Write a protein that binds this ligand. Structure first.
Ligand SMILES: [Mg+2]
Ligand SMILES: [Zn+2]
Ligand SMILES: [Zn+2]
Ligand SMILES: [Zn+2]
Lengths: 119, 214, 230, 49, 49, 116, 696
């Protein structure tokens, strides 16, 4: 989604349709502000989420002693130095796929041999 | 074709069970009459589109020679179906007076979805004759046929009198079948009426229990 | 358990005063989108502000404790993933002492701060009845770890058995795991210390069925003997 | 995140002899404090020294 | 009881002559039943001994 | 128905287928017718037929009820089907002075029981 | 043994790898979950199963290597103390530790102890005690065993009072029940609970498990055992069997009697096969006839050579006469006389089976005096076997269920907490489930099972949806989403809202719960009728999409429509019916040749209840369908079936713990809850609110 606020109010924006020119706007319900929409998408639900998997990957991730290490060669820098964890999306369903974070290039690679990622 | 044929199967399955119940109650219905196939049901009670014509289905039934021996005052029965999913005071007043004029003893009304509280108020309006309401959907499956459902047999006034005499009982002391009980409904039991249940025993092979109506 | 102690409760201000002075931006001036990766710092469930380089702060605070400057009964935890640093001066927290292990060793691997020299330095004082438990505590060889802090550490059971890697085997001995970890922050003084007063009289409790032990630590309380010499 | 473990030992405290006496002494000292006040009223009314 | 949750009361007391004995002349102070050990799995009792 | 058928177828064609347508043519018618019926577608458717037909299989699969798989010990016996194919699992039914109840199950004929 | 210990170590070693192999397989996302289970749930099941298979193998290794001189083996052999597991745990390997059924869980964030790395699903991390008690436990093994050990102590502690109160309620509900001088079981109101005690009018002490021969075997094997044909030279009784053997051949008058005999035996066979559907022969009945024969044989020093001094009339009529003397009820009237016949039915089938002519002569080789004595003894024993008026069968039954409950330690709520559910006539039960048996023919057809599974297991638009989106697409004819461009180009060729509801469905999910874009779309279309314009991407097309539009102010309107869509739109299945599992249950059925043979069937297992609806489903056996919720059985199938289900349920709770309580006890409880006309609970509400005495 990614929504905007009113400059002047800082209050949130409500969508208004410009019936005449068939176009979407964003009105402020505290002042007389109006701005045209960036995207046609107003609301996104998302039931089968993937946002949470690689959360809290601070560059300090290597400083956690609790995290386990592996000798897996990186797809980028080919470094056999990396820390690993499972999908941080705390759901029942969730697969046991592993996320490896490079102790040099910091690139996040997975063990998923069914699908190919970029997060 | 679609999912039309399935509502037919269900109405036919329901009809078989109605016929089953009627024969069981103690009325003259044949086995070939019950065992009527689906194809034969279609080519009888379906219009010029194969849509079920429930008005045609409605039938009269008479007590078997055997039935008048046990229950002499057991009169004739009328079983009416309805093509209108919601049955109202208009269709009900028709059926109600029909039983009073044809001097019927009992009358069953098989309805698709509902019977308005307007129409339901005409149910106990014409005694000594009695009216019963059966939701078509319940009857699709004959519960009496189930593994767990044993033989219930309705006792006569004399048979009852004898039971109580033989066991030195007050009606209080007998185990009770609830008036609304699926089987008490199937048999059209009235308050005071007694059933004789014959169940199989891992103990004795055959065990006879009795239940009085609520 | 034998080595368990309970936090008496100290003063939070020397730590709040210390924090602000060591790069802690106060909450009163926080601007979430400006510093968005900011590690949020708490002292007894009171959010005091944020810090930009917790890595260095955490090390300073740990050195403060291991020196004695910050009391040893004070609990401080750094949950990297959650971007949080919680501190407890709080009374009532149950803690246990553990040996400190440091990657810090010129000669070789990650090794337990305490050396055979300290051990003889103690047994010298054992023969005298100058080197106390406090002496190991202020020399930062050993530390106090409550349950919340335990969450962020990584402990070795045995020191010697769980330290140098592999460069026949007795069959009668129990099957043991390994020292695969290169991450080890602490080591267990002795695993038998997980037991309380009563269970500590049970001979070979590692050879009994779980409840039979639970039974003895109930019966020995009803066993006769000399209770006091007076 | 996961629902909080209500049984995590780190989230439990032990109230020992110290805090137990402190809890009791508080309610016992406020019991004394407000009995002295009841006296200061009784002794300022009649100036009974 | 021993230190292994192996409790019991005295059923009888026998004098030394009635007691079973080693060729060495040693006699038990206590006779405990084999039937205790299996179901209970108190191996440390046997090792203690 | 027719318408438806026719338408538706127609428507267818446109667508683618164309081519176828163309063729137508041619063729026849027838175828237608046838357608109506068936328806046719597949056949118617392709080319979907494959996938659409294959997709049903995954759905069959998703319709079968988990199989409690368990071992059978060759020193444990049934009281009816007098056969050495029984499974067990022990629990602590009694206090810490008697220990281990051990429940049995004739994995073939279906009787269950206790040992104390 | 030294090598047995090497062999044990290497058994755990290989199982340890088998586990790593399934772990590596799961981490690589190649693992394929069992229908009705998480990918993780499925994995843990495997791990737990291998590790146990292992503990047992390791155990069975030692058990075999220990000689007969092993004092432990010796105690286990006599049955004096200890079992297999005790040897296993002591000598070889303790095994996996459980708490709440699952392995030791992550009490600490992503780990079981601080001595482990995060996300460690290894046996050693989740509580597998590799070592024997003889070897000793590692600190980790020691603490995990301690967690697992503590669990048992908790239930031992709790169960103790829960179990106690259950006992009280059973006793207080039954106290006033006893057998009167009319063989009737009545309460303090004289209300009949049972017409005759435990349906047979016998005292439970006087009963023993006996085999009803007639029941099983081939139709041919029966014939050989029972048939006497004096009109056939091969099937007559050889003159070696009895003295009259020579003069008996061709006796038409006598043959009339053996025809009655055989005809009754055949009658009996069918009848018993109706009672005991599985074909179970062994049943508890009074009078051990087997023993009486044995005794007659030593008492009379029965010469298995010389021929008998019995007549066919002596046997045939002798038995017919003995039967009339097996008195349970005495009254002179049809009701009481028919009642007597009823109570005695089963025992007689046994009696007729064990005392048929061929049997008595060929097998037993009885003399007339031996037979005369056997008959008198059956009579005497039978009479001694009847219940004594005064028997306080109420308390008896309560205590006979109460005491065993006191010794109590698809996955369905069972034991003590289930008995609690049962007695309380608990409305909101914990594991409601239907057991859906298939139509007679298509019983072995797995594909038919799947068809019903699909037709019954509940499916909502939510279960198939990846995400729903609201877009402003003002031209109904042309789309701002270039992906969808092709879907319009068709679902237009071979007025409405500018606001679009676009939802993406999951191909993988759309398959496991077999569905088509067409059929999904049809449901939405048929839900909102002519007030919502629906279009959908084809099953073939890469992405799975459904585009919806309505027919000033519209934003909130569509957010309501999407909630209705996900939460209220039912695709497949019956409401309340979730997780439907397919199951290959084994069924004992008579073969054409006569003998009862294993003919397994496909059965469905529900995770919820809707009786009325699932019964009316085509492709099932509406005659066989069962639910654990007897409250439902009662409501749908009547109070009689309510009783049968309620007993079935009670019986299971006892037999699950591997315990046996005689029928009558459970029968009585079940009957008492029943008699009123509904489900009267063993609670302050139920029984205690009846017409009994106020002090009571
Ligand atoms: Mg005891
Ligand atoms: Zn504004
Ligand atoms: Zn890299
Ligand atoms: Zn078996």
């Amino acid at each position: 989604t990614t929504f905007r606020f009113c400059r002047d109010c800082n209050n949130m924006l409500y969508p208004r349709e410009d019936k005449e020119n068939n176009r979407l706007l964003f009105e402020c319900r505290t002042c007389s502000y109006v701005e045209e929409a960036g995207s046609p998408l107003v609301y996104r639900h998302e039931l089968i989420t993937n946002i949470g998997e690689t959360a809290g990957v601070v560059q300090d991730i290597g400083s956690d002693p609790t995290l386990p290490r592996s000798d897996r060669e990186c797809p980028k820098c080919h470094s056999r130095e990396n820390v690993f964890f499972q999908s941080q999306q705390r759901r029942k369903d969730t697969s046991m796929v592993l996320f490896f974070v490079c102790l040099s290039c910091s690139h996040i690679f997975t063990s998923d041999q069914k699908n190919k990622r970029t997060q | 074709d679609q999912e039309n044929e399935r509502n037919i199967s269900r109405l036919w399955r329901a009809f078989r069970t109605v016929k089953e119940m009627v024969k069981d109650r103690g009325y003259f219905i044949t086995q070939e009459e019950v065992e009527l196939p689906l194809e034969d049901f279609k080519a009888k009670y379906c219009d010029s589109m194969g849509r079920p014509q429930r008005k045609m289905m409605s039938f009269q039934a008479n007590p078997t020679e055997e039935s008048i021996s046990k229950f002499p005052d057991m009169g004739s029965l009328w079983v009416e179906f309805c093509d209108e999913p919601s049955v109202g005071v208009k269709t009900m007043k028709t059926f109600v007076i029909h039983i009073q004029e044809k001097n019927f003893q009992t009358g069953i009304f098989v309805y698709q979805n509902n019977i308005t509280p307007s129409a339901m108020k005409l149910v106990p309006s014409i005694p000594p004759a009695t009216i019963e309401t059966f939701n078509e959907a319940a009857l699709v499956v004959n519960i009496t046929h189930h593994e767990l459902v044993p033989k219930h047999i309705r006792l006569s006034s004399d048979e009852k009198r004898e039971l109580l005499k033989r066991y030195r009982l007050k009606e209080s002391q007998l185990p009770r079948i609830q008036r609304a009980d699926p089987v008490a409904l199937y048999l059209g039991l009235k308050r005071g009426e007694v059933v004789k249940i014959i169940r199989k025993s891992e103990t004795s092979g055959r065990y006879a229990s009795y239940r009085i109506c609520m | 358990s034998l080595m368990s102690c309970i936090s008496v409760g100290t003063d939070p201000m020397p730590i709040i005063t210390f924090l602000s002075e060591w790069g802690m931006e106060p909450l009163e001036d926080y601007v979430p989108h400006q510093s968005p990766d900011a590690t949020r710092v708490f002292v007894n469930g009171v959010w005091h502000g944020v810090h930009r380089n917790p890595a260095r702060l955490m090390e300073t605070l740990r050195t403060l404790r291991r020196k004695g400057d910050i009391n040893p009964e004070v609990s401080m935890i750094r949950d990297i993933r959650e971007k949080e640093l919680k501190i407890f001066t709080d009374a009532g927290r149950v803690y246990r002492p553990l040996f400190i292990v440091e990657d810090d060793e010129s000669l070789g691997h990650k090794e337990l701060k305490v050396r055979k020299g300290h051990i003889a330095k103690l047994m010298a004082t054992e023969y005298q009845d100058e080197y106390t438990w406090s002496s190991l505590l202020n020399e930062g060889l050993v530390e106090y770890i409550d349950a919340e802090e335990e969450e962020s550490i990584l402990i070795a059971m045995q020191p010697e058995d769980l330290e140098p890697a592999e460069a026949d085997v007795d069959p009668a001995k129990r099957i043991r795991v390994s020292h695969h970890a290169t991450t080890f922050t602490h080591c267990e003084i002795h695993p038998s210390m997980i037991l309380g007063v009563a269970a500590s009289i049970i001979p070979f409790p590692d050879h009994n069925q779980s409840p039979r032990n639970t039974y003895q630590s109930a019966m020995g309380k009803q066993a006769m003997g000399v209770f006091l010499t007076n | 995140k996961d629902q909080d473990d209500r049984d995590h030992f780190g989230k439990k405290r032990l109230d020992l002899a110290g805090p137990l006496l402190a809890q009791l002494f508080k309610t016992l000292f406020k019991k004394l404090t407000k009995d002295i006040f009841r006296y200061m009223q009784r002794t300022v009314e009649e100036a009974h020294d | 009881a021993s230190r292994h949750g192996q409790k019991g009361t005295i059923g009888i007391t026998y004098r030394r002559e009635d007691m079973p004995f080693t060729a060495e002349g040693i006699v038990p102070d206590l006779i405990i039943n084999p039937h205790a050990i299996p179901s209970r799995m108190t191996v440390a009792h046997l090792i203690e001994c | 128905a027719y318408k438806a058928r026719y338408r538706i177828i127609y428507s267818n064609v446109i667508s683618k287928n164309n081519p176828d347508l163309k063729h137508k043519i041619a063729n026849g018618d027838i175828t237608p017718e046838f357608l109506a019926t068936c328806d046719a577608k597949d056949l118617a458717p392709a080319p979907l037929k494959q996938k659409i037909e294959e997709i049903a299989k995954q759905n069959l699969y998703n319709a079968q009820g988990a199989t409690i798989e368990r071992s059978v010990t060759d020193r444990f016996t049934c009281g009816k089907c007098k056969e050495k194919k029984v499974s067990y699992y022990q629990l602590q039914t009694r206090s810490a002075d008697e220990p281990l109840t051990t429940f049995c199950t004739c994995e073939a004929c279906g009787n269950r029981w206790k040992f104390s | 043994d030294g090598p047995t210990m090497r062999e044990i170590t290497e058994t755990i070693a290989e199982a340890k790898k088998k586990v790593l192999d399934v772990t590596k397989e799961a981490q690589a996302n190649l693992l394929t979950a069992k229908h009705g289970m998480t990918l993780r749930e499925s994995f843990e099941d495997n791990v737990v199963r291998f590790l146990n298979e292992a503990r047992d193998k390791a155990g069975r290794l030692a058990e075999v290597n220990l000689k007969d001189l092993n004092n432990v083996k010796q105690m286990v052999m006599a049955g004096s103390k200890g079992s297999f597991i005790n040897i296993a745990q002591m000598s070889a390997c303790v095994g996996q530790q459980s708490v709440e059924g699952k392995r030791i869980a992550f009490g600490f964030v992503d780990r079981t102890l601080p001595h482990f790395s995060k996300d460690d699903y290894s046996p050693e991390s989740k509580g597998f005690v590799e070592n024997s008690y003889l070897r000793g436990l590692t600190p980790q093994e020691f603490f995990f065993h301690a967690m697992g050990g503590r669990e048992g102590l908790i239930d031992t502690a709790v169960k103790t009072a829960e179990t106690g109160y259950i006992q009280r309620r059973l006793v207080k509900a039954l106290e006033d029940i006893m057998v009167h001088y009319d063989n009737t079981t009545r309460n303090s109101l004289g209300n009949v609970i049972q017409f005759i005690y435990g349906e047979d009018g016998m005292d439970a002490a006087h009963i023993e498990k006996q085999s009803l021969d007639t029941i099983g075997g081939s139709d041919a094997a029966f014939e050989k055992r029972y048939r006497v044909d004096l009109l056939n030279t091969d099937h007559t009784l050889d003159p070696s069997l009895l003295e009259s053997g020579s003069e008996i051949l061709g006796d038409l008058k006598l043959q009339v009697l053996l025809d009655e005999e055989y005809k009754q035996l055949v009658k009996d066979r069918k009848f018993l096969r109706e009672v005991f559907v599985d074909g179970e022969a062994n049943w508890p009945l009074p009078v051990n006839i087997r023993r009486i024969i044995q005794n007659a044989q030593q008492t009379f020093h029965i010469d298995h050579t010389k021929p008998s001094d019995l007549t066919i009339k002596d046997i045939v009529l002798g038995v017919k006469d003995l039967q009339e003397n097996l008195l349970v009820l005495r009254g002179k009237n049809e009701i009481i006389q028919n009642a007597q016949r009823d109570a005695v039915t089963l025992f007689c089938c046994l009696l007729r089976s064990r005392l048929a002519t061929r049997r008595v002569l060929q097998e037993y080789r009885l003399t007339k005096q031996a037979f005369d004595w056997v008959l008198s003894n059956i009579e005497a024993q039978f009479l001694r076997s009847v219940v004594h008026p005064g028997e306080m069968v109420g308390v008896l039954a309560a205590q006979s269920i109460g005491e065993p409950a006191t010794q109590m330690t698809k996955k369905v709520t069972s034991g003590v907490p289930r008995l609690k559910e049962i007695l309380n006539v608990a409305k909101n039960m914990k594991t409601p489930s239907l057991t859906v048996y298939l139509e007679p023919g298509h019983a072995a057809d797995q594909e038919q099972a799947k068809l019903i599974r699909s037709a019954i297991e509940h499916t909502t638009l939510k279960s198939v949806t990846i995400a729903s989106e609201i877009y402003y697409d003002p031209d109904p004819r042309s789309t701002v989403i270039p992906e969808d461009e092709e879907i319009i180009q068709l679902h237009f060729s071979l007025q409405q809202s500018p606001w679009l509801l676009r939802l993406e469905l999951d191909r993988a999910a759309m398959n496991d719960k077999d569905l088509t874009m067409g059929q999904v779309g049809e449901r939405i279309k048929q839900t909102f009728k002519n007030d919502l314009f629906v279009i959908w991407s084809e099953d073939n097309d890469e992405k799975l999409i459904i585009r919806c539009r309505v027919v000033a102010e519209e934003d909130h309107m569509l957010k309501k429509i999407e909630n209705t869509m996900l939460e209220n739109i039912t695709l497949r299945g019956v409401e309340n019916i979730e997780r439907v599992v397919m199951m290959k249950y084994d069924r004992k059925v008579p073969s054409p040749t006569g003998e009862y043979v294993k003919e397994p069937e496909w059965v469905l297992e529900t995770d919820g209840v809707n009786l009325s609806e699932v019964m009316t489903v085509p492709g099932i056996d509406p005659t066989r369908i069962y639910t654990n919720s007897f409250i439902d059985i009662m409501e749908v199938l009547g109070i009689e079936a309510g009783r049968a289900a309620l007993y079935k349920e009670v019986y299971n709770v006892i037999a699950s713990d591997g315990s046996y309580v005689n029928y009558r006890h459970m029968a009585l409880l079940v009957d008492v809850m029943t008699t009123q006309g509904g489900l009267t609970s063993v609670t302050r509400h139920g029984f205690n609110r009846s017409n009994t005495g106020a002090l009571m």
